[PDB]
Amino acid sequence: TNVYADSFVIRGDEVRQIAPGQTGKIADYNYKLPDDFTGCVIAWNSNNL
Amino acid sequence: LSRLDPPEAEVQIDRLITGRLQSLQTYVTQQLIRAAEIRASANLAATKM
């Protein structure tokens, strides 16, 4: 029906916090995914930019 | 519910739900069989009266 693309830049080892049911600082206070999240999480290193 | 977060708690709650539901279904089936037996006995008693 629709697709929402959420764009942000994150520090490396805490990228694992972006997933359903995760706990952690980014998942807690910055970007919480729902436990029944349907979608894809796409990330890449951006030290060049 | 006090020890675990919702995503971690859910898998335990599902096991408890399945177990208790199976126990309750077994109880209801046993009660149905016993009710059939008692119905036969009650029909016999009504005929005897």
Swiss-Prot record, chain A:
Residues 11-13 are annotated as: Integrin-binding motif. Changing N48K: In strain: Omicron/BA.1, Omicron/BA.2, Omicron/BA.2.12.1, Omicron/BA.2.75, Omicron/BA.4, Omicron/BA.5, Omicron/BQ.1.1, Omicron/XBB.1.5, Omicron/EG.5.1. Changing D13N: In strain: Omicron/BA.2, Omicron/BA.2.12.1, Omicron/BA.2.75, Omicron/BA.4, Omicron/BA.5, Omicron/BQ.1.1, Omicron/XBB.1.5, Omicron/EG.5.1; complete loss of interaction with host integrins. Attaches the virion to the cell membrane by interacting with host receptor, initiating the infection. The major receptor is host ACE2. When S2/S2' has been cleaved, binding to the receptor triggers direct fusion at the cell membrane. When S2/S2' has not been cleaved, binding to the receptor results in internalization of the virus by endocytosis using host TFRC and GRM2 and leading to fusion of the virion membrane with the host endosomal membrane. Alternatively, may use NRP1/NRP2 and integrin as entry receptors. Binds to host ACE2. RBD also interacts with the N-linked glycan on 'Asn-90' of ACE2. Cleavage of S generates a polybasic C-terminal sequence on S1 that binds to host Neuropilin-1 (NRP1) and Neuropilin-2 (NRP2) receptors. Interacts with host integrin alpha-5/beta-1 (ITGA5:ITGB1) and with ACE2 in complex with integrin alpha-5/beta-1 (ITGA5:ITGB1). May interact via cytoplasmic c-terminus with M protein. May interact (via N-terminus) with host bilirubin and biliverdin, thereby preventing antibody binding to the SARS-CoV-2 spike NTD via an allosteric mechanism. This is Spike protein S1. The gene is S.
From Swiss-Prot, chain B:
This is Spike protein S2'. The chain holds residues 981 to 1029 of 1273 of the full protein. Changing L1F: In strain: Omicron/BA.1. It comes from Severe acute respiratory syndrome coronavirus 2. Subunit of the fusion protein that is processed upon entry into the host cell. Mediates fusion of the virion and cellular membranes by functioning as a class I viral fusion protein. Contains a viral fusion peptide that is unmasked after S2 cleavage. This cleavage can occur at the cell membrane by host TMPRSS2 or during endocytosis by host CSTL. In either case, this triggers an extensive and irreversible conformational change that leads to fusion of the viral envelope with the cellular cytoplasmic membrane, releasing viral genomic RNA into the host cell cytoplasm. Changing S2A: In strain: Alpha/B.1.1.7.
